[PDB]
Each structure stands twice: as structure tokens, then as C-alpha cells.
XYZ file of C-alpha atoms in Angstrom:
659
model
C 6.262 -28.998 -22.821
C 3.849 -26.068 -23.285
C 4.638 -22.376 -23.784
C 1.502 -20.796 -22.341
C 3.531 -18.921 -19.724
C 5.512 -16.987 -22.354
C 2.589 -16.173 -24.647
C 0.613 -14.827 -21.708
C 3.550 -12.561 -20.747
C 3.866 -10.821 -24.138
C 0.197 -9.801 -24.040
C 0.717 -8.400 -20.540
C 3.623 -6.164 -21.619
C 2.056 -4.506 -24.707
C -1.392 -3.896 -23.151
C -1.018 -0.106 -23.299
C -3.039 2.685 -24.971
C -0.349 3.570 -27.537
C 1.144 0.094 -27.991
C 4.340 1.022 -26.112
C 5.912 -1.603 -23.836
C 5.395 -1.865 -20.044
C 6.555 -4.261 -17.289
C 4.715 -7.101 -15.484
C 4.869 -5.232 -12.158
C 3.372 -2.160 -13.879
C 0.529 -4.371 -15.197
C -0.520 -5.757 -11.790
C -0.069 -2.463 -9.922
C -2.072 -0.462 -12.470
C -4.800 -3.149 -12.128
C -5.423 -2.976 -8.374
C -5.149 0.846 -8.753
C -7.799 0.862 -11.517
C -10.272 -1.915 -10.599
C -12.548 -2.105 -7.551
C -13.637 1.193 -5.961
C -11.256 4.163 -5.419
C -11.778 7.536 -3.709
C -9.975 10.695 -4.959
C -8.862 12.773 -1.970
C -8.384 16.094 -3.856
C -11.655 16.363 -5.845
C -13.812 13.974 -3.702
C -14.895 11.990 -6.778
C -15.180 8.172 -6.601
C -14.570 5.730 -9.474
C -15.845 2.098 -9.689
C -15.221 -0.513 -12.437
C -16.428 -4.120 -12.676
C -16.015 -6.970 -15.210
C -19.300 -8.729 -15.899
C -19.673 -9.848 -19.537
C -22.969 -11.780 -19.129
C -24.766 -8.727 -17.692
C -26.506 -6.112 -19.844
C -26.850 -3.289 -17.292
C -25.228 -2.606 -13.935
C -26.395 -0.479 -11.001
C -24.608 0.318 -7.727
C -26.935 -0.025 -4.660
C -26.603 0.226 -0.893
C -27.410 2.261 2.184
C -25.902 5.343 0.431
C -28.825 5.578 -2.021
C -31.373 3.543 0.003
C -30.925 0.536 -2.307
C -32.319 2.546 -5.283
C -32.108 0.534 -8.521
C -32.226 3.466 -10.986
C -30.137 6.470 -9.887
C -26.520 5.253 -10.240
C -26.216 3.385 -13.534
C -22.718 2.716 -14.775
C -21.490 3.788 -18.225
C -21.708 1.311 -21.098
C -19.214 -1.557 -21.189
C -16.057 -0.802 -23.158
C -14.772 -3.339 -25.692
C -13.334 -5.442 -22.800
C -16.628 -6.074 -20.944
C -15.975 -3.602 -18.082
C -18.621 -1.178 -16.751
C -17.402 2.122 -15.278
C -18.789 5.066 -13.280
C -17.509 8.397 -11.882
C -19.432 9.619 -8.816
C -19.299 13.392 -8.454
C -18.923 14.784 -4.914
C -22.224 15.626 -3.244
C -23.516 19.180 -3.398
C -22.056 19.697 0.100
C -18.662 18.478 -1.150
C -18.626 15.067 0.624
C -17.902 11.593 -0.751
C -21.126 10.072 -2.033
C -20.682 6.704 -0.186
C -20.285 6.656 3.650
C -17.527 4.689 5.396
C -18.228 0.990 6.278
C -21.828 1.105 4.975
C -23.354 -1.881 3.167
C -23.256 -2.139 -0.642
C -24.076 -4.549 -3.447
C -23.974 -4.521 -7.251
C -27.155 -5.508 -9.112
C -27.080 -7.004 -12.591
C -29.884 -7.327 -15.113
C -29.461 -10.696 -16.830
C -30.310 -11.595 -20.443
C -33.609 -13.168 -19.319
C -34.454 -9.898 -17.541
C -34.201 -11.352 -14.025
C -32.087 -9.790 -11.266
C -29.276 -11.108 -9.040
C -27.506 -9.408 -6.120
C -23.770 -9.798 -5.380
C -20.958 -8.604 -3.170
C -18.518 -6.815 -5.565
C -15.695 -9.164 -6.502
C -12.817 -6.871 -5.383
C -14.467 -5.685 -2.088
C -12.109 -5.296 0.897
C -14.448 -6.285 3.820
C -17.494 -8.587 4.505
C -19.421 -9.541 7.713
C -21.604 -12.300 9.248
C -25.310 -11.431 9.746
C -27.164 -10.662 12.959
C -29.522 -13.216 14.516
C -32.511 -11.160 13.279
C -31.253 -10.938 9.689
C -30.392 -14.665 9.767
C -33.845 -15.906 10.834
C -35.159 -13.947 7.832
C -32.535 -14.149 5.074
C -30.371 -17.029 6.288
C -26.635 -17.124 6.991
C -25.436 -14.995 4.015
C -22.622 -12.473 4.678
C -22.765 -8.699 3.853
C -20.218 -6.432 2.077
C -18.806 -3.072 3.310
C -17.217 0.078 1.714
C -13.957 0.703 3.622
C -12.768 4.350 3.276
C -11.455 5.394 6.713
C -10.556 8.980 7.637
C -7.010 7.879 8.462
C -5.372 4.784 6.981
C -2.671 3.037 9.000
C 0.839 4.227 8.069
C 3.542 1.548 8.215
C 6.479 2.645 10.397
C 8.896 -0.284 10.070
C 10.795 -1.645 7.107
C 10.474 -5.296 6.116
C 12.998 -7.467 8.010
C 16.348 -8.099 6.325
C 16.024 -11.494 4.640
C 17.742 -13.237 1.711
C 15.815 -16.335 0.638
C 18.858 -18.133 -0.773
C 20.980 -17.800 2.378
C 18.698 -17.769 5.505
C 16.718 -20.483 7.454
C 12.984 -20.336 8.278
C 11.226 -22.013 11.257
C 7.427 -21.818 11.090
C 4.721 -21.649 13.789
C 1.363 -22.763 12.312
C -1.447 -20.832 13.992
C -5.197 -20.086 13.948
C -6.440 -16.776 15.383
C -9.803 -17.953 16.755
C -8.815 -20.949 18.908
C -5.804 -19.202 20.498
C -7.249 -18.918 24.056
C -8.225 -21.292 26.913
C -11.837 -19.949 26.709
C -14.619 -21.492 24.629
C -14.987 -18.554 22.138
C -13.484 -16.865 19.015
C -10.324 -14.797 19.823
C -9.298 -11.589 17.932
C -6.377 -10.099 15.943
C -5.536 -7.667 18.746
C -5.509 -10.488 21.338
C -3.073 -12.377 19.122
C -0.904 -9.245 18.754
C -0.794 -8.718 22.538
C -1.007 -12.277 24.031
C 0.386 -14.779 21.501
C 3.059 -12.866 19.559
C 5.129 -12.842 22.809
C 4.778 -16.631 23.275
C 5.974 -17.205 19.685
C 8.869 -14.802 20.169
C 9.807 -16.736 23.354
C 9.750 -20.073 21.463
C 12.006 -18.486 18.767
C 10.306 -19.113 15.374
C 11.348 -17.085 12.252
C 7.902 -16.884 10.642
C 4.209 -17.228 11.396
C 1.980 -19.174 8.985
C -1.516 -17.704 9.405
C -4.288 -20.190 8.589
C -7.880 -19.169 7.893
C -7.387 -15.457 6.964
C -9.116 -15.203 3.577
C -12.799 -14.849 4.497
C -14.926 -18.020 5.012
C -18.394 -18.573 6.513
C -18.152 -22.231 7.733
C -15.891 -22.212 10.820
C -15.405 -25.968 11.227
C -13.762 -26.012 7.748
C -10.557 -24.728 9.369
C -10.437 -21.924 6.719
C -10.444 -24.068 3.537
C -13.844 -22.912 2.028
C -13.273 -19.252 0.819
C -16.007 -16.734 -0.083
C -14.338 -13.270 -0.549
C -10.771 -13.138 -1.945
C -9.761 -9.445 -1.462
C -11.196 -9.412 2.131
C -9.338 -10.376 5.324
C -11.642 -12.259 7.725
C -13.904 -10.118 9.889
C -14.680 -12.554 12.750
C -11.373 -11.410 14.332
C -11.424 -7.593 13.476
C -10.673 -4.907 10.774
C -8.107 -4.323 7.940
C -6.167 -1.769 9.999
C -5.949 -4.193 12.978
C -4.162 -6.711 10.726
C -1.766 -4.128 9.200
C -0.718 -3.269 12.755
C -0.334 -6.980 13.600
C 2.060 -7.341 10.645
C 3.856 -4.028 11.282
C 4.389 -5.339 14.852
C 5.717 -8.760 13.825
C 8.014 -6.859 11.432
C 9.397 -4.783 14.317
C 9.969 -8.093 16.122
C 11.963 -9.314 13.098
C 9.293 -11.907 12.211
C 8.096 -12.571 8.661
C 4.363 -13.130 8.114
C 3.063 -15.551 5.478
C -0.504 -16.020 4.232
C -2.364 -19.303 3.638
C -3.540 -18.653 0.056
C -6.397 -20.842 -1.199
C -6.342 -20.477 -5.000
C -7.160 -24.203 -5.534
C -10.972 -23.992 -5.218
C -13.790 -21.761 -3.954
C -16.884 -22.118 -1.787
C -20.133 -23.192 -3.460
C -21.905 -20.147 -1.905
C -23.626 -17.911 -4.477
C -24.418 -14.437 -3.104
C -21.579 -13.928 -0.644
C -19.219 -15.950 -2.919
C -18.144 -16.086 -6.597
C -20.342 -19.013 -7.700
C -22.664 -17.674 -10.469
C -21.437 -14.063 -10.012
C -22.650 -12.592 -13.349
C -25.478 -15.147 -13.701
C -23.547 -17.659 -15.831
C -21.841 -21.005 -15.266
C -18.632 -19.874 -17.061
C -17.077 -16.644 -15.783
C -14.508 -17.341 -13.047
C -15.010 -21.153 -13.037
C -15.165 -24.150 -15.360
C -18.699 -25.229 -16.148
C -20.126 -28.456 -14.709
C -20.858 -29.792 -18.208
C -17.157 -29.373 -19.061
C -16.449 -32.513 -17.028
C -13.214 -31.057 -15.669
C -13.650 -32.859 -12.350
C -14.273 -32.066 -8.699
C -12.217 -31.672 -5.564
C -12.023 -35.064 -3.773
C -12.183 -33.750 -0.173
C -14.217 -30.489 -0.311
C -17.631 -29.838 -1.883
C -16.486 -26.840 -4.038
C -15.905 -25.125 -7.483
C -12.666 -24.767 -9.636
C -11.138 -21.726 -11.514
C -10.514 -21.134 -15.267
C -6.905 -19.926 -15.351
C -6.993 -19.304 -19.169
C -9.209 -16.165 -19.015
C -7.326 -12.838 -19.348
C -9.379 -11.131 -16.620
C -8.955 -14.155 -14.278
C -5.154 -13.795 -14.666
C -5.521 -10.053 -13.906
C -7.718 -10.881 -10.855
C -5.464 -13.498 -9.216
C -2.165 -11.714 -10.049
C -3.391 -8.337 -8.771
C -4.544 -10.288 -5.648
C -0.912 -11.298 -4.981
C 0.506 -7.777 -5.607
C -2.263 -6.298 -3.431
C -1.390 -8.426 -0.347
C 2.361 -7.690 -0.805
C 2.014 -3.904 -1.394
C -1.069 -2.928 0.657
C -0.608 -5.285 3.670
C 3.193 -5.853 3.432
C 2.873 -9.653 3.621
C 6.219 -11.285 2.885
C 5.214 -14.512 1.077
C 2.686 -17.327 0.650
C 1.703 -20.975 1.291
C -0.505 -22.300 -1.533
C -2.993 -24.906 -0.266
C -4.414 -27.806 -2.264
C -1.553 -27.966 -4.823
C -2.099 -31.719 -5.339
C -5.641 -31.100 -6.544
C -4.459 -28.321 -8.916
C -1.595 -30.249 -10.531
C -3.572 -33.258 -11.846
C -6.661 -33.540 -14.015
C -8.073 -36.248 -11.666
C -7.215 -33.989 -8.651
C -5.508 -36.765 -6.671
C -8.010 -39.628 -7.134
C -0.452 -38.532 -13.326
C -1.851 -36.427 -16.177
C -0.939 -32.740 -15.618
C -3.116 -29.621 -15.924
C -0.922 -27.135 -17.858
C -3.196 -24.069 -17.469
C -3.200 -24.379 -13.666
C 0.572 -24.916 -13.811
C 1.177 -21.868 -16.043
C -0.741 -19.632 -13.579
C 1.503 -20.765 -10.709
C 4.544 -20.005 -12.911
C 3.478 -16.415 -13.654
C 2.512 -15.988 -9.987
C 6.033 -16.923 -8.853
C 7.534 -14.457 -11.411
C 5.443 -11.497 -10.210
C 6.040 -12.207 -6.509
C 9.819 -12.399 -6.961
C 9.840 -9.289 -9.230
C 8.029 -7.336 -6.470
C 10.624 -8.111 -3.715
C 13.916 -8.914 -5.492
C 15.878 -11.600 -3.559
C 13.518 -11.663 -0.487
C 10.114 -13.214 -1.386
C 8.992 -16.716 -0.148
C 6.493 -19.274 -1.594
C 5.475 -22.768 -0.253
C 3.405 -25.707 -1.638
C 0.992 -28.241 0.014
C 1.404 -31.324 -2.199
C 0.800 -34.902 -0.956
C 1.846 -36.422 -4.279
C 5.407 -35.087 -4.450
C 5.490 -33.853 -8.070
C 9.066 -33.502 -9.453
C 10.443 -30.043 -10.526
C 7.789 -28.135 -8.514
C 10.470 -26.333 -6.443
C 13.107 -25.512 -9.188
C 13.523 -22.004 -10.712
C 11.855 -20.795 -13.893
C 15.068 -20.314 -15.918
C 15.479 -24.121 -15.591
C 11.895 -24.970 -16.629
C 10.608 -25.341 -13.061
C 7.541 -24.228 -11.178
C 9.346 -21.552 -9.193
C 8.320 -22.571 -5.638
C 10.873 -22.231 -2.857
C 9.620 -25.151 -0.587
C 7.100 -28.084 -0.142
C 5.556 -29.881 2.926
C 6.600 -33.400 4.117
C 3.174 -34.928 4.658
C 4.096 -38.626 5.108
C 6.128 -38.394 8.346
C 3.361 -38.424 11.049
C 2.152 -41.908 9.984
C 5.440 -43.657 10.812
C 5.105 -42.963 14.547
C 1.494 -44.243 14.850
C 2.292 -47.682 13.423
C 5.103 -48.092 15.957
C 3.085 -47.406 19.115
C -0.024 -49.355 18.112
C 1.488 -52.706 17.102
C 5.020 -53.289 18.477
C 6.323 -54.127 21.919
C 9.113 -51.789 23.015
C 11.672 -54.588 22.698
C 10.952 -54.835 18.948
C 11.524 -51.317 17.570
C 13.372 -51.171 14.207
C 16.000 -48.406 14.026
C 16.899 -48.685 10.329
C 13.280 -48.148 9.281
C 13.170 -44.852 11.189
C 16.288 -43.364 9.516
C 15.251 -44.279 5.960
C 11.858 -42.573 6.284
C 13.294 -39.273 7.490
C 16.080 -38.808 4.861
C 14.304 -39.829 1.589
C 13.880 -36.464 -0.263
C 14.557 -35.118 -3.776
C 17.657 -33.033 -4.482
C 17.194 -29.337 -5.215
C 13.616 -29.298 -3.855
C 13.553 -27.997 -0.284
C 11.145 -29.483 2.299
C 9.283 -28.410 5.507
C 9.274 -31.258 8.131
C 6.999 -32.006 11.176
C 5.978 -34.982 13.432
C 2.194 -34.522 13.846
C -0.321 -32.517 11.809
C -3.204 -30.163 12.518
C -5.636 -32.987 11.657
C -4.252 -35.549 14.143
C -5.293 -33.188 16.962
C -9.032 -33.582 16.073
C -11.905 -35.669 17.506
C -11.903 -39.278 16.358
C -8.079 -39.265 16.187
C -5.185 -39.484 18.648
C -2.248 -37.198 19.311
C 1.237 -38.500 20.042
C 0.680 -37.948 23.762
C -2.473 -40.120 23.947
C -0.900 -43.046 22.059
C 1.876 -43.025 24.685
C -0.063 -42.726 27.988
C -3.876 -43.144 27.406
C -6.258 -42.416 30.327
C -3.497 -42.317 32.962
C -2.890 -38.742 31.742
C -5.997 -37.691 33.736
C -4.706 -38.935 37.110
C -0.938 -39.497 37.000
C 0.265 -36.317 35.234
C 0.711 -34.812 38.724
C 4.099 -33.788 40.096
C 3.074 -34.853 43.621
C 3.488 -38.629 43.190
C 6.508 -40.359 41.727
C 5.922 -41.342 38.071
C 4.207 -44.653 37.500
C 5.766 -46.992 34.956
C 3.477 -45.651 32.202
C 4.092 -41.893 32.725
C 7.895 -42.186 32.955
C 8.031 -43.952 29.588
C 5.656 -41.453 27.959
C 7.331 -38.115 28.734
C 10.762 -39.243 27.537
C 9.579 -40.500 24.136
C 7.577 -37.330 23.384
C 10.705 -35.132 23.386
C 12.901 -37.596 21.452
C 10.381 -37.813 18.581
C 10.275 -34.050 17.896
C 14.066 -33.559 17.924
C 14.944 -36.292 15.429
C 12.248 -34.850 13.109
C 13.680 -31.283 13.376
C 17.334 -32.132 12.731
C 17.192 -35.008 10.198
C 13.957 -34.500 8.244
C 13.959 -31.354 6.080
C 15.181 -27.866 5.081
C 12.628 -25.958 7.240
C 10.450 -26.868 10.277
C 6.739 -26.561 11.241
C 4.812 -26.978 14.540
C 1.025 -26.878 15.132
C -0.250 -24.708 18.016
C -0.439 -26.743 21.260
C 1.573 -29.843 20.423
C 4.759 -28.162 21.618
C 3.594 -29.137 25.165
C 1.645 -32.440 24.815
C -1.888 -30.930 24.858
C -4.212 -33.685 26.163
C -7.684 -34.608 24.896
C -8.777 -33.490 21.395
C -9.755 -30.432 19.275
C -13.309 -29.912 17.943
C -15.005 -26.874 16.382
C -18.652 -25.978 17.157
C -20.916 -28.014 14.866
C -24.188 -29.927 14.619
C -22.954 -33.139 16.259
C -21.848 -31.597 19.589
C -24.667 -29.030 20.023
C -22.407 -26.188 18.759
C -20.186 -26.717 21.788
C -16.981 -24.690 22.104
C -15.718 -26.971 24.931
C -12.911 -28.362 22.711
C -12.524 -25.362 20.320
C -9.722 -23.825 22.354
C -6.140 -24.314 23.486
C -5.411 -25.110 27.156
C -2.422 -22.763 27.394
C -3.290 -22.762 31.136
C -1.729 -26.216 31.577
C 1.657 -24.696 30.660
C 1.177 -22.163 33.480
C 0.260 -24.737 36.219
C 3.195 -25.886 38.383
C 1.522 -28.976 39.858
C 1.592 -30.695 36.425
C 4.210 -31.867 33.935
C 3.022 -30.059 30.759
C 5.510 -27.167 31.139
C 8.378 -29.674 31.009
C 7.568 -30.336 27.358
C 7.110 -26.619 26.400
C 10.500 -25.524 27.764
C 12.148 -28.221 25.649
C 10.620 -26.745 22.455
C 11.934 -23.188 23.021
C 15.459 -24.555 23.535
C 15.328 -26.484 20.236
C 14.395 -23.459 18.055
C 16.905 -20.997 19.531
C 19.659 -23.577 19.074
C 19.128 -23.565 15.291
C 19.230 -19.766 14.861
C 22.705 -19.619 16.421
C 24.034 -22.846 14.830
C 22.357 -23.041 11.401
C 21.292 -26.553 10.366
C 17.991 -26.298 8.392
C 18.733 -24.401 5.099
C 21.931 -26.382 4.466
C 22.933 -29.618 2.641
C 21.647 -33.001 3.902
C 23.104 -34.830 6.959
C 25.623 -37.700 7.067
C 24.332 -40.614 9.236
C 26.769 -42.906 11.090
C 24.818 -45.276 13.434
C 21.495 -47.195 13.894
C 21.927 -50.259 16.215
C 19.256 -52.987 16.370
C 20.026 -54.682 19.741
C 21.159 -51.568 21.691
C 18.681 -49.134 19.966
C 20.942 -46.048 19.305
C 21.041 -43.549 16.314
C 23.709 -40.826 15.479
C 24.606 -38.278 12.661
C 26.230 -34.878 11.546
C 24.902 -31.721 9.715
C 26.453 -28.303 8.704
C 29.306 -29.291 11.054
C 27.158 -30.194 14.145
C 26.432 -33.638 15.808
C 23.294 -35.535 17.154
C 22.726 -38.778 19.318
C 19.595 -40.854 20.499
C 19.024 -43.945 22.871
C 15.656 -45.823 22.638
C 16.310 -49.013 24.766
C 13.492 -49.932 27.248
C 15.530 -51.025 30.307
C 19.308 -50.560 29.745
C 21.576 -47.493 30.167
C 25.029 -47.259 28.512
C 28.461 -46.122 29.778
C 31.320 -45.147 27.389
C 29.469 -45.481 24.067
C 31.573 -44.544 20.998
C 30.248 -42.024 18.381
C 31.984 -40.902 15.105
C 32.967 -37.355 13.962
C 34.690 -35.976 10.843
C 36.337 -32.606 11.749
C 38.881 -32.790 14.579
C 38.531 -30.483 17.576
C 36.715 -30.034 20.878
C 32.912 -30.347 21.072
C 30.370 -29.200 23.669
C 26.737 -30.199 24.256
C 24.270 -27.525 23.119
C 20.967 -29.404 23.868
C 19.977 -32.293 26.257
C 16.577 -34.007 26.844
C 17.209 -35.411 30.389
C 17.268 -31.986 32.124
C 15.069 -31.813 35.217
C 13.517 -28.662 33.698
C 12.334 -30.937 30.856
C 10.945 -33.678 33.175
C 14.071 -35.903 33.215
C 16.183 -37.303 36.039
C 19.320 -35.141 35.556
C 21.684 -38.064 34.952
C 23.831 -36.283 32.263
C 26.693 -33.798 32.866
C 26.709 -30.967 30.269
C 29.995 -29.278 31.309
C 32.062 -32.123 29.851
C 34.508 -31.373 27.029
C 34.469 -34.131 24.378
C 37.911 -34.354 22.748
C 38.156 -36.224 19.445
C 40.297 -39.353 19.133
C 42.177 -39.673 15.810
C 40.825 -43.121 14.886
C 38.182 -44.004 12.304
C 34.740 -45.048 13.516
C 31.390 -45.589 11.772
C 33.064 -44.283 8.566
C 34.222 -40.927 10.034
C 37.779 -39.714 10.661
C 37.532 -39.356 14.508
C 35.318 -40.399 17.462
C 34.017 -39.352 20.908
C 32.643 -41.388 23.902
C 29.307 -40.661 25.704
C 27.051 -41.759 28.603
C 23.368 -42.071 27.589
C 20.627 -43.436 29.919
C 17.724 -45.582 28.719
C 15.417 -43.201 26.712
C 17.429 -39.848 26.250
C 19.049 -37.673 23.423
C 21.756 -34.885 22.895
C 23.277 -32.339 20.354
C 26.932 -30.976 20.170
C 28.982 -28.280 18.234
C 32.672 -27.458 17.538
C 34.536 -24.827 19.577
C 36.316 -22.233 17.405
């Protein structure tokens, strides 16, 4: 439709001093090696460069020259609008700027006034002290990171081929990852939570809220400093070790990348960086719209230095931190000119195309990219040789709403099985999907988790092991396990789980904020319930670990769609097959079934590999897992063979073929 992607690539490849040709990787590597600030370890010189076309003069200031506005003026802009400076070593032979001290760049504007900014490619920035804040407000401060010894990676990236391998994703947030009302750290995650995720068996960790942001209750979505990992949890070397460690564990690490919008903050953010309304962002008079959920600003992808900035940002996280891939947030607001309330923004789309090219050129056959897109735009996840966007996956954001309607309005006798199957299997061919049954927003104040819809206030008295389950608690535990498993096996090409729902976390989540007196009482995760043996929460957690490890041995996610054979409206039973394996579910409120027939297409002997009625999962142990299920050579539910099962009221099972 438009050929902006190809025009922009020719200019990249002949942007050399002699006119000779270079590669796209060479462009983005030479950029993060040439822009920002860089120390020379052999001569002790330092070089700094900075794009700022609206500014007339530029001066580097900070603790290293006592914020002097005259002594370190940069050389005149070249024909591309870039200031530059070489700092000689001091007379004693030392670097002229000390390590982790505070710095700013000052610009003189056309009207002669002065503004103060954190440099745009800085690698660290920090929240102010209570004394500074009473005076100057809540603005963050930027730091010059030049340590005496940089962390040296010891492990290679894990062996991974995107086309062939499955990926199961644990969605996590560093700060809430403890039972205490506080902000937890990178090192605590490395030592206390990486083992829990390895026990549960996920392939990858999706890190939310890593790009730096000042407003905590925004869950990470309002970004201020793009080349800086967040300081409220620790330092750049702490994170490199966290990733080196996951890599030794065989775990890929992905970054939540927010390139859809930016914070409205001015001094600690990019809004009005060089004084003007039109450097990184579209001007307000351009009428190019606003984000419908977040008070924010939007980028101008057509500027050559903005392409250099965002593309170097991707190569920097891959090369310098050894991240393995990305989830792009807010894709629905980027794709459309009305930002989600059918007319497409082709400049924003061309940037995502070039971004997918670079990332796959950097790690041939291994790199991963994912999209957050409510709308479901077609061709987003097809390759570039076929005209596509180049994404590998998208999220399945409609599924959680099906379960809420069921519990609020219907008696148990009146559940509709055919409606449940249709919702889970409706996806577009060639465009792979990440599925889940409740989202990180459903866990918040004012909302209700799955667990609360099922059992209500009786969770605060009758979740004890000491008394036999009441009628309400028995019903509730069984349904919580059945809902996750049918989502995992029937609903997509990858899986996702939000921290805490793997065990039925009660009550709600709430960050510190004005309406609760900045209370951290609900800004935490009661991992301690999993560790208490007088309660039933551990029953749900042990079920989750068994689900994930089953998939890694018997692949079923990154494979073709399932064939479904049953969905009965008076008995309330569902059954299907995928990548050669078999799945069965019974939802009836009072009746248990003996000798129920189930269909199967490849003859042989089958054995159960997962079962929800285990006592260790809170069940009543009515089901015998040592049984061999031989196939009968007779057609059933449109398959070539069948087996016969016993399934009590409210239980589910999975089976595979013995070679």
C-alpha cells in the first residue's frame, strides 16, 4: 500500500562518509557506539554528542564542574543538527566526570531563555529525596554510569529456534513480588522468585514496568527515560546478572517495550526536550489525536533521528543487556489514526516493520516479538517477505469476559457448553496467539477475581482444612482448576499467567495512591498463603506446576489447532485432541458418570498425564490414574476409535499415546 519501509532502508545503507554501502546492523550499532556519552579507556578522553536542532548553544553541567554554565561548551552543530565535545583527561590523568554523579544538559533557546534536561540517551535516573522534593517537587535526577568494572556475561544465550519451539510466559512485576507492604528489588527477584518460576516450569519471563517511570500506580505504562532501566529496584549491573542467571537456568527474558506513547513530564521526560513542540513528538496543533486511556504524548516516526533513536534502542537492549525479545504495548493505539475510539497510520506501521527487520537480523533464527492489540488487526503477525508486519505473536484479550458472564447470571443447571468451545477456538490462521483466563487488571480494587466470583465472603472463614467443605467451598475449588486447563490447551499458540492467580489469591490488588492514604496493604502478593498447611491455597498452586511441565515434555502449544469431538448440553461434558494428545471435562452440578465414551483418531494405548481430582489438588481422589485405555476400532464423535472413562461431577483429565 505504501513503500515507506523500503525508502527508509536505502538511506540507512548509504549513510557513509565516502558513499560506500553498509548494512542495517552496522547502522544501529555505530549509532549507540557514537551517540550518548562514551569513555575511552586508553587515552582517558570522553566524547558526548546530542541532537537538538531548536537549540543555539549547548553546555554540559553537573557536579563535575559545579553546575558551571560556561566552561564546557560543545563544538558547533554539524550539518545534521548534532553538537559534539571531546573532554581531555584531567591534568592528573583521570576521567573528567566522576562515576554515578548527577548531570544535565542546558540549552539556550531562540528567545534566550534556558531549560534543563536529562540527556536523552542517559543510562540511569533516580527519584528525589524528601528534602529535594519539598523544594523542587517530584522530578527525577540523571546519573553518569562509568563503573570501574562492568559485568562480564559468562553464559551463552539459550538454544532456541523461534519457528520450532513453544513458549510459556510468566507475567511479573518486580516491586509487588513479596508478602510485605513495600517495593522489592532485582536481587530479591533473582534469589527468591526465579526459583518459584523455575519450579512452575515456564519458558520465559515477561518483565513489566522496567523502562523508567515515576508514577507507580500506573503499573509501568507512563515512561520517562527510554535508555534507563528502572532504579527503584537497583542498578544496571544487577539486571545484567539477573538476565545472565535466567540464561543459565535456560530461561529467556523479554522486555515490556512502551513505544506507543510517553509521559507528559517535561524535565525528567522527553516532552519539550529542546524547547519546541515538534522534535520527538507530533505537535498538539497537528490534530493527530490522543491516547484514549492515558494522559500522554505521541511520537513522530518519520524523522530520521527518531528512527535512529528507537532502532538503536532495540539494538542496545539486545547487545548490551542480552535481552532475547520484546512485547510491544499499546499496539491498538498505534495502528489507527483514532487510536481505538479502521483508518491505518502508515508511518507508525513502517517503524514497526523496520524494527522487526533489525531485531531478526541481530539474532538470526532466534529473536521473539509480541503485540498487545485489542482490535485484532489482520496481517500483523505475518512475515515481511509476504507484506506483513513481522510480529511473531499477539495477545487474546477477549477470553476473561466469557467466564464473568457465566457466574453472575446463570444457575449451574443452565450452563451452555457450545458457547464455551466457540469462544476459545475462533482465531486467524497464520497469526499465533497468547491465551489466558484472567488479566492483570481483574486483580485490582473495584473488580473481582475468578476466586471471589465463585465463593464470596465464605473464603474468609471456610477456606480451612480443619472442617469438611461446606457446599459453597466444594463447588468453588473444583471450578477454578477446570477453567485454567481448558484455556491452556484449547485457546492459543502460547500461554500467559499473572503473578498470584496460579493459587487463587483472595482479596484485591491496590498500589499506594491518594485514595487509600498511600497504603501498601494491598500492594503485595500473599505468597505466604501457599506456604500455610492449614489452608487450601497450596492445592491450586501445585496444579499449575503440573500443567506447565506436561507441555514441555508433550508439546501442544506451538502446533496446529485442535480437533474437537464433544460438547453435551444435558450431561455437560467437553472433549478434544491436539498434536496427538487428548483432553476431557465434566461440568454437571450433581451427577457423576460411569463408562462414558470418548473418541480418538490414532490407534494405540493411552495413559493419563494430568488429573484435577488428586487429593494434592484439593479433590476427593475418586479417579484411578494407573489404568491403561485401549482403543476400540469403532467410529465415535467423528474419530476412527474410542475409549471409555469414569468422570465425577466437576473434574477433568489429559492423556497421551505410548510409543
